[PDB]
Amino acid sequence: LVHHSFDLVIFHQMSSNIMEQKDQQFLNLCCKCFAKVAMDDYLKNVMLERACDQNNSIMVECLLLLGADANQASSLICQVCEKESSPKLVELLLNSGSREQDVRKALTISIGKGDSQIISLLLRRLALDVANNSICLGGFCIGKVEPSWLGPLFPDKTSNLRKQTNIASTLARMVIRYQMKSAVEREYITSLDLSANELRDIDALSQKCCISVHLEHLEKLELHQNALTSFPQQLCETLKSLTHLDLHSNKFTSFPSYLLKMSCIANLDVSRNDIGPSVVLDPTVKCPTLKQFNLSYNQLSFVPENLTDVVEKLEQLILEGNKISGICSPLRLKELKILNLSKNHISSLSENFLEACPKVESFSARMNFLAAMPFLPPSMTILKLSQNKFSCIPEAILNLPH
Amino acid sequence: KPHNVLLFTLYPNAAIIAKIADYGIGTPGFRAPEVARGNVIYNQQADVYSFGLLLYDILTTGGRIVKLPDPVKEYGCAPWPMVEKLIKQCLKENPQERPTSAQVFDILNSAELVCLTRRILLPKNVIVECMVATHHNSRNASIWLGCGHTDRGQLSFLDLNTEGYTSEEVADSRILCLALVHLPVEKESWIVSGTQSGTLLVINTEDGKKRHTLEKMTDSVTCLYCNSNFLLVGTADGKLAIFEDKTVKLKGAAPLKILNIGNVSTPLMCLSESTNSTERNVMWGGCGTKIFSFSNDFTIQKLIETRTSQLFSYAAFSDSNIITVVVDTALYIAKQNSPVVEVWDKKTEKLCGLIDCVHFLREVSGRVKTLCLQKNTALWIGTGGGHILLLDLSTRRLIRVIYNFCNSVRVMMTAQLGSLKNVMLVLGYNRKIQSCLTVWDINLPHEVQNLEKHIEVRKELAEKMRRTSV
Amino acid sequence: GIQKCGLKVISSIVHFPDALGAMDSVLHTLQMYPDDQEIQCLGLSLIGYTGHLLAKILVSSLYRFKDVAEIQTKGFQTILAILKLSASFSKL
Numbered sequence A: 001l002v003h004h005s006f007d008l009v010i011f012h013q014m015s016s017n018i019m020e021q022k023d024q025q026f027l028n029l030c031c032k033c034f035a036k037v038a039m040d041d042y043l044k045n046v047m048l049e050r051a052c053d054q055n056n057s058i059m060v061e062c063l064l065l066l067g068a069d070a071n072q073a074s075s076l077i078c079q080v081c082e083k084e085s086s087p088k089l090v091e092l093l094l095n096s097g098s099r100e101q102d103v104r105k106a107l108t109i110s111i112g113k114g115d116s117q118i119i120s121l122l123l124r125r126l127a128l129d130v131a132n133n134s135i136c137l138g139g140f141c142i143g144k145v146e147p148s149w150l151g152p153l154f155p156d157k158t159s160n161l162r163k164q165t166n167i168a169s170t171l172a173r174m175v176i177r178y179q180m181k182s183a184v185e186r187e188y189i190t191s192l193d194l195s196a197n198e199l200r201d202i203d204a205l206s207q208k209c210c211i212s213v214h215l216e217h218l219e220k221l222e223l224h225q226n227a228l229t230s231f232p233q234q235l236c237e238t239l240k241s242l243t244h245l246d247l248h249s250n251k252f253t254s255f256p257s258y259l260l261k262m263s264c265i266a267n268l269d270v271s272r273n274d275i276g277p278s279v280v281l282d283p284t285v286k287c288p289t290l291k292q293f294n295l296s297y298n299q300l301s302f303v304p305e306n307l308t309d310v311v312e313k314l315e316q317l318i319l320e321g322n323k324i325s326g327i328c329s330p331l332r333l334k335e336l337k338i339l340n341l342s343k344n345h346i347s348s349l350s351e352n353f354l355e356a357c358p359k360v361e362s363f364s365a366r367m368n369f370l371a372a373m374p375f376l377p378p379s380m381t382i383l384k385l386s387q388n389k390f391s392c393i394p395e396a397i398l399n400l401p402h
Numbered sequence B: 001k002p003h004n005v006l007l008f009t010l011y012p013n014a015a016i017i018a019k020i021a022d023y024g025i026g027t028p029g030f031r032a033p034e035v036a037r038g039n040v041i042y043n044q045q046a047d048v049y050s051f052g053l054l055l056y057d058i059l060t061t062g063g064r065i066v067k068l069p070d071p072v073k074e075y076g077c078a079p080w081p082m083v084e085k086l087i088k089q090c091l092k093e094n095p096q097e098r099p100t101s102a103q104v105f106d107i108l109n110s111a112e113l114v115c116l117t118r119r120i121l122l123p124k125n126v127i128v129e130c131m132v133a134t135h136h137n138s139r140n141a142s143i144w145l146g147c148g149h150t151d152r153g154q155l156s157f158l159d160l161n162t163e164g165y166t167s168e169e170v171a172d173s174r175i176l177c178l179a180l181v182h183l184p185v186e187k188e189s190w191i192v193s194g195t196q197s198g199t200l201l202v203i204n205t206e207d208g209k210k211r212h213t214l215e216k217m218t219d220s221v222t223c224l225y226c227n228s229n230f231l232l233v234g235t236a237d238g239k240l241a242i243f244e245d246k247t248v249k250l251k252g253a254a255p256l257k258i259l260n261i262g263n264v265s266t267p268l269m270c271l272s273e274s275t276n277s278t279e280r281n282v283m284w285g286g287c288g289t290k291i292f293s294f295s296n297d298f299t300i301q302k303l304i305e306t307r308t309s310q311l312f313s314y315a316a317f318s319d320s321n322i323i324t325v326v327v328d329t330a331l332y333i334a335k336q337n338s339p340v341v342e343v344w345d346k347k348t349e350k351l352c353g354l355i356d357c358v359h360f361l362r363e364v365s366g367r368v369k370t371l372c373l374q375k376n377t378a379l380w381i382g383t384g385g386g387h388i389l390l391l392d393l394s395t396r397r398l399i400r401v402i403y404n405f406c407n408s409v410r411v412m413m414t415a416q417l418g419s420l421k422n423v424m425l426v427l428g429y430n431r432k433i434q435s436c437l438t439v440w441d442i443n444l445p446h447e448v449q450n451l452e453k454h455i456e457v458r459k460e461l462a463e464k465m466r467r468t469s470v
Numbered sequence C: 001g002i003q004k005c006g007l008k009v010i011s012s013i014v015h016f017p018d019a020l021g022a023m024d025s026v027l028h029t030l031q032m033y034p035d036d037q038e039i040q041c042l043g044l045s046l047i048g049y050t051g052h053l054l055a056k057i058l059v060s061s062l063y064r065f066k067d068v069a070e071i072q073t074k075g076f077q078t079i080l081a082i083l084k085l086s087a088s089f090s091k092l
C-alpha cells in the first residue's frame, strides 16, 4: 500500500483542509488507517522521505512526533535543503535529532543556492549558544558573510512566542491513542567568532539589515585566520562597545590607524600579518583605553612611532618576530608592564630608552645580537635575555633591586 | 594535567569538544599520594585520582594551579554539589575506594549532575510545611520558610548567598500557608502567613519590629496568593477575602470584598493564575471538588464539579479534595492522597485526560504531592514518595523520573535568584526527619533530552570509527 | 498574472547575445503557472551548464497537458538540447 501510491492520496486528503469540518468519523477512520500502517517503522521512514520530497510541512511534524528516524538516509536535511523548501520543514527537521555532519553539509548546500532564510535557520542550530551570548561561526568555511544571515541569530527582542498551529500535535495524539487502542484490542550577543571561515572581506557589514543596532553592543570579534586586507571604517565607528578585537593570521599590509578610534577598544591584536615596514600612529588619535597591543611576526622595521602620544596607557607591547634594526627613540609609556622584543635584529639598545617607563616588570629580548644592557628601571622582575651574545653579565643587571 | 587536554571548540552543544594528549616531553602537583610515596606502578586506580584533581581544577577554574581544601570556600565558585561528591569520592586515600573509570563516566552522564545547583540541609530538621521566595532581585536572595513546630508557629528565614538561617516563633499557632507582597511605589514589602489559630499576620521585611494583625475568620487559613493589585485569601470553610495591597500596610486592615465560594465541608486549597497572557483576567481556585474561576471583578464566572470523576476513575481517589490547580490550555488537577492526575478543559467543563503516575513509578507509595508547570511544556509532578516526574505537555509522556535525593517531596516553587536566573526550589523530606531544599536549574528537561542525544551521537561516532579502523 | 507578458519580454531578450541566473526564476514561474508559461517555456535555453527538480518540472509540464501539439515538439527540442549538453541527463 505504502509502496504504490498511499502517500499521494493520504497527504492530499489530510492536508486539503481536513480540519475545520464536521467529519469526525471521517478523520477517525483515517487515523485508524494511519495507526494501522504505523507498524513496521521502516515504512514510517519511507513516509517521511516521501513527505519531505514534497513540500508538505503539515504532516512531517506528525510523522516526527509518532517517531521517525530523521537521520535515516545524502541525508534527509541535505535533500530537503537541496530542492526549494519551506523554512517550517527544515526547522522541524533541525528540532528533531539529525547528525551534525549532515547539518554541516546542508549548510554548505544552502550556501551554494543563496537563501538567507535557510542559512539563518541552520546557523541558529550550528553556531548559537544563548547561555554564553555568543555566535560561534569558527571554521565553517563560509566564504562570505551577509547581515541577512546573522539577522535572526541576534535576539531581536521585538520577536515573541506564538503557537501558529496545533493540528499536527493533536492529530499525532489521536493516532497514538488509536494505535494504543488497536494494540490493546536585554541579553545582547557579546561575541561573534568569524575566525577561520576563509573570508576575503567584511565589506557587506555596513548600515546592515537590523545587524547595525546589534553590533553596537558587541564586546569581542574574533576575525583571525581569515584573509582580510582592510577593516571597513564604518564598522570601526559602528562597533561602539568592543574590547577584544582579533585580526591575526590575516593578510594585512598597513595598520589602519582609525582602529584606535573605537570607543572602548582594549586589546588589539594585529599579529602574523605582513604589516610593514613601519607603523606610524597618527598624533590626532588618542586611544587611552588600549591596554594591550600585539604587533608580533609582522615585517616592522621600527618601533611603532607616536606610541606615547597615541596609546597613552599601554600595558603589554609585544613586538616579537619583527625585523627591528635597533632602538633609537626612548619609549615614554608611563604604564608599560610587559615589553617583548624577542626574535628581532637589535644589536644595542639606546642608553636611556627605558628610563622613562618606570613600571616595567617583564622584558624579553631573546634571539637578538645584544651585547650590552643599558640602564633599566628598578621594578624589573623578570628579565629573559637569551641566545643573544653576552660575553659577560652586565653590571646594570646585577643592581636590580627585585 | 590540564596541559594534556585539548579543546577543539567552545560551543556547548558540540559532538567533540575535549580530547586527551601525551606529548611525550609524575608531576608533583598532579600526582596521587600513593604514586608520590614511590610505592608501586601507576595502575588504573590512580588515574582516577589524577582525574579527580583535573575535575577540581575545572571546578575551581584553574585557581589551584596559580588534604584538598573546600572548593567553595578556598576559592569562589558555585557549589555544584554532585561533582563535589564525585571529587571527594575519587580522591580517597585507599585506592580500592576510588571508583573505576567506567563508573566515573557513568555518574558523569546524569542530567541531575548538570542541573542540581545547591542542596541545603536544615539542621533543626523541623517539619516544614510552607515556604515563599523573596520577590526582590536584590542581594537579599533568600527564602522565608514557614513551618509548624509547637502550639505556636515556627518561622525560619534561610538566606541563599549565606546558606545559614534564623528561626523564630512569632505566630500564636501553627502556620499552613505563606505569601509575600512588595509595593515598589511605597518601597514596602510584607510577608503574610496563614496561622492555624484562625487569623492572618503581617511582618514587614524592612523592620523586624513592624508587625500587624489582620481580620479574623472562624477556620484556619489554608492558602494565600498575591496577584500582580489585590491580595487573595483562602480559608478552609470556603471563604474568599480580597485584601487591597496598599490597605494592609496598616494593622487591622479591611477586606475590600469577601466571597463565600463554598462551605465548611469543603476547604479552599489552591489558587493559581492562567499561564497564557490572553487569559490574564481569570483566577482559578479549588474549593473541595469545585474548580471555580472568578474574573478580575472577584465574581465566579465558571463552576465545575469534580464529583463526576468517580464515573471513570476510582471512587476511592475521586472523593478526596483538590490539592492544586495548574491553569493552562487544560486544567491540571491533583486531589488529596491520589496517585492520579486529572486533566480538564475550561470550555467544555469536562474530563479530557487522566495520568496514572503509578505506571511511570512501577516502571522503575507514589502519592502525588505538588504540581508545577514551566512555559517550556514540562509539567513537574512532585510525588509524595520522593520522586519528581517530568511530563511534556505536547505528548503527555514521561521525560525522566528524578529520585534518590529525598524521601518525600513536600512543596515545589519556581523562583528567581539575585542573578536573574530562574530556578525551581524542591523542599523534600529525609526520614532516616530531615528537610532538604534542592535548587534545580529550570532547564532540567532540555538538559535530559540534549544529553541523551549527545551521548548517542558520540556513541555512533565511536562505533563508526571502530568499524572503519577494523 | 503579469508573468505571462513578462515571459514574453524574456522571450524577446533571449535572442540578444550573452543573455547571462534567470533559469531559476522562469522555473519557479513555470512551477507556479502550469499552462500559459509552459506554452512559452520553449525559450528555456542552455542554462545551468544539476537540480533533478528542474527536469522533473519539465517532464511533468510536458505530461500534465500532453495534448498541445506545439509544446510537445518544443519540449522535445529542449530535452534533446539538454541531453546533448549532458549524457547524465538521460539517467534521471
Ligand SMILES: Cc1ccc(C(=O)Nc2ccc(CN3CCN(C)CC3)c(C(F)(F)F)c2)cc1C#Cc1cnc2cccnn12
Pocket (backbone or CB within 6 Å): B006, B020, B021, B022, B023, B024
Ligand atoms: C603532534 C602530536 C604528536 C603526538 C601526540 C600524542 O599525544 N601522542 C600520543 C602518544 C601516546 C598515547 C598513549 N600513551 C599514553 C601514555 N602512556 C604512558 C602510554 C600510552 C596517546 C594517547 F592519546 F592515547 F593518550 C597519545 C599529540 C600531538 C598533538 C597535538 C596538538 C594538536 N593541536 C594542538 C594544539 C596545541 C598543542 N598540541 N596540539
